[PDB]
């Protein structure tokens, strides 16, 4: 029932999230990420653009995969410093109203009881606007920061993933049954103890008693993002995610990738339309074609090649010591007019793109310019919403639907198992 694209901002609580070395640009303001105010302006611009969500990536780590000198990662600010996403999201509740506030928490960096209790809390406080990107790995230092030798092997990471989701759904959906809150002052019953349960979860990595500590929140289980490119991962996204964060290079790469997920969803026991493919992207924009080309010139100066190699050389492994196109493994940039950019996005949406996962070259410039110039174009073509729909982030992304996840979704299956 949703004929308009989903817009999602893809930022991270660090000086330079995307287009490495781009913190140098005199016109930039990302060096301000430490303050609440910088981000308020970015949050608000986006809600002037009717963006469905703003998403904060997050790491517990920094590593020297380039050569053997961790130098350039502090010198060019490559995902270091890293500040805590969750904390900032709470800090943005008051300076937004309908904007979805999303974040990565990983599996290693917070116990699912703690992570469950925090999510529920934010979900209450935000008024049902919380997004959760499920992360299952993290780098070496990430492990060595919570005292672990080395990484647990790739696919075990997703095994562990499943139990984490086993635990949180139990807490969010299972522990409190419907009608548990009573709030009857005269009768003297706040919460109905016959409807509030332990989980007594006992598995291979997690034991947890419960009950879950929070009142049921507006969404119960926050709006679920996952970004798994691999087999064990894509599988996981197909199983649990409401929107997967993906990076196809051509629209024909999206068409393949869409078809693939559709099969995976059917095996996972879910509808074609239960999951949005959301594309990593970025934009530069102008009135003429020449203004936008000439913007990219300006912005691409401050693009450091050696620090782009430092983020590639961690991921791929290969220690590279055209090459300038490599930020196309992180977002497909589109330069041009609003008409051009809209024209090109139509190909992607036709290839199966359900949403844009928009990153920034400069902040708040990219974000401003996309809202200022592109959003009205897309709104005119009926591709981007004119106004917010009322209700929870789930209710927004999936128009017909209930504030709670569908009966097809793994979460639903926990609803009153312990009744």
Q: Binding site residues for FMN, as ranges?
A: 58, 104, 158, 227, 229-230
Side-chain half-sphere CA neighbours of 362 within 13 A: 21
Backbone φ and ψ of 283, nearest 5°: -140, 145
The span from the CA of 18 to the CA of 12, in Å, is 9
Q: Is 74 helix (H, G, I), strand (E, B) or coil?
A: helix
Q: Which is nearer to a second copy, 7 or 165 (CB)?
A: 165
Question: Smallest distance from the beta carbon of 316 to ligand FMN, in angstroms?
Answer: 11
Residue 261 engages ligand FMN in binding (rule: CB under 6 A): no
Taking CB under 6 A as the criterion, which residues in 354-373 touch ligand FMN? 357
Question: Smallest distance from the beta carbon of 335 to a second copy, in angstroms?
Answer: 24
Of 224-232, 249-257, 336-344, 363-371, the window that binds ligand FMN (rule: CB under 6 A) is 224-232
Question: Smallest distance from the beta carbon of 71 to a second copy, in angstroms?
Answer: 4
Q: Report yes or no: 107 and 226 within 8 Å, Cβ to Cβ.
A: no
Tokens 């393949």 found at: 256
**Using CB under 6 A, which of 280, 336, 338, 391 touches ligand FMN?**
280
How many helices (H) and strands (E) in the chain?
14, 13
**Using CB under 6 A, which of 135, 208, 334, 360 touches ligand FMN?**
135
Q: Which is nearer to ligand FMN, 52 or 377 (CB)?
A: 52
**CA dihedral angle for residue 306, residue 308, residue 314, residue 315, rounded to 10 degrees:** -150
Q: Report yes or no: 171 and 216 within 8 Å, Cβ to Cβ.
A: no
Residue 5 engages ligand FMN in binding (rule: CB under 6 A): no
The span from the CA of 257 to the CA of 348, in Å, is 12
Tokens 């809600």 found at: 47
Residue 352 engages ligand FMN in binding (rule: CB under 6 A): no
Residue 54 engages ligand FMN in binding (rule: CB under 6 A): no
**Using CB under 6 A, which of 59, 307, 345, 393 touches ligand FMN?**
59
Residue 233 engages ligand FMN in binding (rule: CB under 6 A): yes
The span from the CA of 367 to the CA of 46, in Å, is 7
* Closest-CA residue to 242 (of 134, 164, 104, 105): 134
What binding mask, one character per residue, do residues 103-122 give for ligand FMN by CB under 6 A, x or -? -x-x----------------
Contacts with ligand FMN by CB under 6 A lie at: 10, 57-59, 104, 106, 133, 135-138, 227-230, 232-233, 245, 247, 280, 357
């Amino acid at each position: 029932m949703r004929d308009t694209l989903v817009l999602n901002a893809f930022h991270m609580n660090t000086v330079c999230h995307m287009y490495d070395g781009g913190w140098r640009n005199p016109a930039d303001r990302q060096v301000e990420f430490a303050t609440l105010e910088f981000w308020k302006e970015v949050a608000q611009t986006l809600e002037r653009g009717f963006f469905d969500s703003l998403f904060f990536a997050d790491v517990m780590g920094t590593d020297a995969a380039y050569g053997d000198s961790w130098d350039i990662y502090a010198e060019q600010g490559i995902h270091f410093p890293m500040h805590d996403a969750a904390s900032l999201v709470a800090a943005l509740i008051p300076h937004t109203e309908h904007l979805g506030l999303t974040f990565s928490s990983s599996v290693i960096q917070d116990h699912p009881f703690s992570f469950a209790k925090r999510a529920s809390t934010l979900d209450h406080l935000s008024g049902g606007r919380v997004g959760w990107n499920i992360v299952t790995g993290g780098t070496i230092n990430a492990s060595q920061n919570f005292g672990y030798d080395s990484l647990v092997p790739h696919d075990e990471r997703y095994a562990i993933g499943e139990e984490y989701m086993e635990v949180v759904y139990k807490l969010w959906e299972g522990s409190w049954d419907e009608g548990a809150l009573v709030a009857d002052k005269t009768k003297g019953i706040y919460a109905d103890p016959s409807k509030i349960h332990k989980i007594n979860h006992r598995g291979e990595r997690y034991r947890v008693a419960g009950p879950h500590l929070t009142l049921p929140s507006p969404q119960r289980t926050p709006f679920l993002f996952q970004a798994g490119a691999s087999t064990a991962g894509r599988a996981f996204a197909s199983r649990h995610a409401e929107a997967t964060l993906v990076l196809c290079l051509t629209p024909d790469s999206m068409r393949v990738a869409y078809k693939q997920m559709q099969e995976l969803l059917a095996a996972a026991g879910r509808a074609s339309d239960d999951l949005l493919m959301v594309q990593g992207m970025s934009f530069i924009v102008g009135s003429t074609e020449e203004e936008a080309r000439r913007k990219a010139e300006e912005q691409d100066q401050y693009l450091d090649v050696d620090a782009l190699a430092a983020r590639v050389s961690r991921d791929l492994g290969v220690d590279l010591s055209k090459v300038k196109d490599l930020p196309l493994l992180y977002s497909i940039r589109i330069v041009g007019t609003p008409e051009t950019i809209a024209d090109e996005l139509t190909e992607w949406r036709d290839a199966g793109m359900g949403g844009i996962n928009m990153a920034a070259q400069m902040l708040p410039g990219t974000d401003a310019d996309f809202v200022d110039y592109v959003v009205p174009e897309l709104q005119r073509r009926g591709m981007v919403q004119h106004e917010y729909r009322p209700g929870t982030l789930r209710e927004k992304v999936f128009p017909g639907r209930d504030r709670l996840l569908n009966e097809r979704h793994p979460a639903s299956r926990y609803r009153g198992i312990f009744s």
